[PDB]
């Protein structure tokens, strides 16, 4: 309740562009980097494990940064959610963020967040699986 | 020496550097490191070289970051504990937008710390890796 | 480009380079990883595996081509402002020279980046072809 | 649709230019992203099928949407050329995708632009084609 309602719109927008252009793009890399590690035959194990932990640490870090953004974005919606001031975003990927109806643009954004979380969670989960699989194999 | 509200405006600009430029660079570098590890191809002489290279970049950036922080601390020497602590929407800390200026000061200090932690932690890994590789030949 | 304002060219050169860094290279990094990812996948079949490489190959060639086009324009720009003060300044996080005060260095930096980029692209297409041969002989 | 013969010939130049910067800086960039997104989907093992198919349809829809927006721009750009085509007023554009748009000769700049359009269309069509192939491949992979 502290800022101008349209300033929040502008912020919300910026916030979201982070998620799309930075947060998600990092995540796509990381998913691929994981697969890449698995592909590298056996190495030793001490060496393989190390690289996952290493990966894991980065993913947790980046997930955390992502969450912080989301969090600030949700807090913004605490004011402009269910309002006209829901920002408009020509995303190439979720079609709803450009929708003329602000309800839809809200939905769109919530979806994007969920999706993003799903994917992050799902990655940390695989990495942990792999680390257990390797643990027991050694 | 300067107008108390000019310093506010500067502090704000200073901080937007940290968030929008310093941190973003750091996030990239963290990812670049991981990327190097992932790459088999090379030899070792070639692998090592790329880390040193990375290392140099990180130390360079860390240095630039420290310089900003330093200026920002100096600014707070004046407007710390005051009403003129700038207000910043931010996606990395909720306190910078807080109506209470004390909180906004705390927020900023936290951000700095967190940043330093991350930078230090990276240079540390890079050095570990460089030793690991050293011994592996 | 013998036609444009020397500082307009600076601004263009800069924009050109941000493409390479922020778009061209970022795509390339993903593609390299996508290749490795394909190799990692069992079972699929073969008809299905090959198809996905060709598919990848096509994209890489396409994106390499787009990258070359940019470079090309960038070289043409340097035909004018190469060896000049108007060489653009770029805080890249990756090549340190593009921010150098000396414009000679900034030129060198840029040339290096290009080379590096080409190396990486060429090297990828070459692996993909190897793999496609390896697979060809392993099946048909 | 409409026609332009009536606007100021240099206003059209300015518009044509703006129109083209859309294609280069927005339309093409979107397309490059989409091509990469497709490849990315194929790469993903994990999910199911109902889930895989869905994401393609989704992609497909986006591509058709974007292609449509692109066509609309082109269309306007062609209409503009109906007037300033074969003229001196063909706009001048530095470009990283075609060397001809900066050419001093306006004939060349016209050629350049036409080429860019074509190329763009080729790429868009080619993507929708692959996506449809993939969707059939997946469809048949469900069976007895």
Q: How far apart are CA C64 and CA C60, in angstroms?
A: 6
A75 Cβ contact partners less than 8 Å away, ≥ 6 residues apart: B94
Show which residues on chain D lie within 8 Å of chain A, measured between beta carbons.
Answer: 30, 33-34, 37, 40, 43, 46, 61-62, 65-66
Residue A40 CB neighbour total at 10 angstroms: 15
Q: How far apart are CA D99 and CA C74, in angstroms?
A: 10
CB contact under 8 A, D43 and A32: yes
Q: How far apart are CA A130 and CA A45, in angstroms?
A: 12
CA nearest neighbour of A64 among D53, B93, B46: B93
Q: Using an 8 Å Cβ cutoff, are C67 and C121 in contact?
A: yes
Query: Left if phi > 0, otherwise alpha if psi is -120 to 50, otherwise beta: which for C82?
Result: beta
Q: Using an 8 Å Cβ cutoff, are D100 and D111 in contact?
A: yes
Q: How far apart are CA C80 and CA C103, in angstroms?
A: 14
D47 is written with which tokens? 């999910």
D32 Cβ contact partners less than 8 Å away, ≥ 6 residues apart: C23, C27, C63, C66
Element (H, E) at A119: helix A102-137
Q: How far apart are CA C7 and CA D12, in angstroms?
A: 26
A104 to chain C nearest CA, in Å? Answer: 30
DSSP percent split of chain C into helix, strand, coil, nearest 5: 80, 0, 20
Q: How far apart are CA C74 and CA C68, in angstroms?
A: 10
CA dist B77 → A49, B24, B106, C109 (Å): 46, 27, 14, 39
Query: Left if phi > 0, otherwise alpha if psi is -120 to 50, otherwise beta: which for D38?
Result: alpha
- List the determination method: X-ray
Q: Using an 8 Å Cβ cutoff, are D79 and D72 in contact?
A: no
- B20-27 contact pairs (CB < 8 A, 24+): B22/B61, B22/B64, B22/B65, B22/B68, B22/B115, B23/B92, B23/B115, B24/A22, B25/B61, B25/C93, B26/B61, B26/B65, B26/B115, B26/B118, B26/B119, B26/B122, B27/A22, B27/A26, B27/A62, B27/A65
In chain C, residues with a C-beta closer than 8 Å to the C-beta of A33 are 33
A115 to chain D: closest CA residue = D55
Q: Using an 8 Å Cβ cutoff, are B32 and B112 in contact?
A: no
CA dist D119 → D23, D44, D98 (Å): 11, 29, 11
Chains that touch C (3 or more CB pairs under 8 A): A, B, D
Q: Using an 8 Å Cβ cutoff, are C19 and C74 in contact?
A: no
Q: How far apart are CA A118 and CA D42, in angstroms?
A: 19
Q: How far apart are CA A2 and CA B100, in angstroms?
A: 11
C-alpha dihedral (B75, B77, B81, B87), degrees to nearest 10: 10
CA nearest neighbour of D31 among D135, D119, D94: D119
Q: How far apart are CA C87 and CA C93, in angstroms?
A: 18
Residue D6 CB neighbour total at 10 angstroms: 8
B89 is written with which tokens? 């929407």
D110 is written with which tokens? 């016209």
Torsional sign, CA B72, B74, B79, B81: positive
Number of domains forming the structure of chain D: 1
* DSSP sequence for A25-75: HHHHHHHHHHHHHHHS----SHHHHHHHHHHHHHHHHHHHHHHHHHHHHHH
D78 is written with which tokens? 């062609």
Determine B/D contact with 3+ CB pairs under 8 A as the test: no
Q: Using an 8 Å Cβ cutoff, are B59 and B126 in contact?
A: no
A60 to chain B nearest CA, in Å? Answer: 12
Q: What is the CA radius of gyration of chain B?
A: 19
> What backbone torsions phi and psi does residue D7 show, to the nearest 5 degrees?
-75, 165
Torsional sign, CA B119, B123, B128, B132: positive
Query: Left if phi > 0, otherwise alpha if psi is -120 to 50, otherwise beta: which for A43?
Result: left
Domain of residue D130, residue span? 1-144
Residue B21 CB neighbour total at 10 angstroms: 16
B74 is written with which tokens? 């100096």
C-alpha dihedral (C35, C37, C42, C45), degrees to nearest 10: -40
D29 Cβ contact partners less than 8 Å away, ≥ 6 residues apart: C23
CB contact under 8 A, A61 and B99: no
Look at residue A84 and give its three-state secondary structure: coil
- C84-87 contact pairs (CB < 8 A, 24+): C84/C6, C86/C6, C86/C7, C86/C9, C86/C10, C87/C10, C87/C13
Burial class (CB in 10 A: 0-12, 13-18, 19+), B12: middle
Q: Using an 8 Å Cβ cutoff, are B122 and A44 in contact?
A: no
CA nearest neighbour of D138 among D27, D32, D63, D59: D59
D39 is written with which tokens? 């490849």
In chain D, residues with a C-beta closer than 8 Å to the C-beta of C30 are 36, 40
Show which residues on chain C lie within 8 Å of chain A, measured between beta carbons.
Answer: 26, 29-30, 33-34, 36-37, 39-40
- In eight-state DSSP terms, residue B39 is -
Q: Using an 8 Å Cβ cutoff, are D92 and D101 in contact?
A: yes
Q: Using an 8 Å Cβ cutoff, are A56 and A123 in contact?
A: no
Of C56, C66, C76, the CB nearest to D97: C66
CA dist C14 → B21, B64, B127, C3, D3 (Å): 18, 22, 34, 18, 37
Q: How far apart are CA D42 and CA A88, in angstroms?
A: 30
B82 is written with which tokens? 């005051």
CA nearest neighbour of C67 among C32, C27, C9, C10: C27
Q: Using an 8 Å Cβ cutoff, are C28 and C117 in contact?
A: yes
Interhelix angle for C26-40 vs C47-81, to 10°? 160
CB contact under 8 A, A93 and D62: yes
A118 to chain B nearest CA, in Å? Answer: 20
Q: Using an 8 Å Cβ cutoff, are A22 and A65 in contact?
A: no
D22 is written with which tokens? 């859309």
Q: Using an 8 Å Cβ cutoff, are A72 and B94 in contact?
A: yes
C42 Cβ contact partners less than 8 Å away, ≥ 6 residues apart: none
User: In three state form, how does the secondary structure of chain D look?
Assistant: CCCCCCCCHHHHHHHHHHHHHHHHHHHHHHHHHHHHHHHHHHHCCCCCCHHHHHHHHHHHHHHHHHHHHHHHHHHHHHHHHHHHCCCCCCCCCCCCCCHHHHCCCHHHHHHHHHHHHHHHHHHHHHHHHHHHHHHHHHHHCCCC
CB contact under 8 A, A2 and B97: yes
Q: What is the CA radius of gyration of chain A?
A: 19
CB environment C5-28: b (16+ within 10 A), e (fewer): eeeebbebbeebbebbbebbbebb
């Amino acid at each position: 309740h502290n800022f101008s309602k349209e300033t929040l719109q502008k912020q919300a927008k910026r916030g979201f562009l982070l998620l799309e252009r930075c947060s998600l793009v990092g995540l796509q890399q990381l998913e691929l980097e994981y697969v890449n590690l698995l592909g590298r035959s056996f190495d030793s194990y001490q060496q393989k494990t190390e690289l996952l932990n290493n990966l894991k640490e980065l993913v947790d870090e980046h997930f955390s940064d992502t969450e912080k953004i989301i969090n600030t974005l949700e807090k913004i919606f605490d004011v402009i959610g269910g309002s006209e001031y829901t920002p408009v975003l020509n995303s190439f990927f979720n079609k709803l963020l450009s929708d003329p109806d602000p309800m839809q643009r809200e939905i769109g954004l919530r979806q994007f967040i969920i999706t993003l979380r799903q994917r992050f969670k799902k990655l940390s989960q695989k990495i942990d699986s792999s680390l257990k699989q390797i643990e027991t194999e050694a």
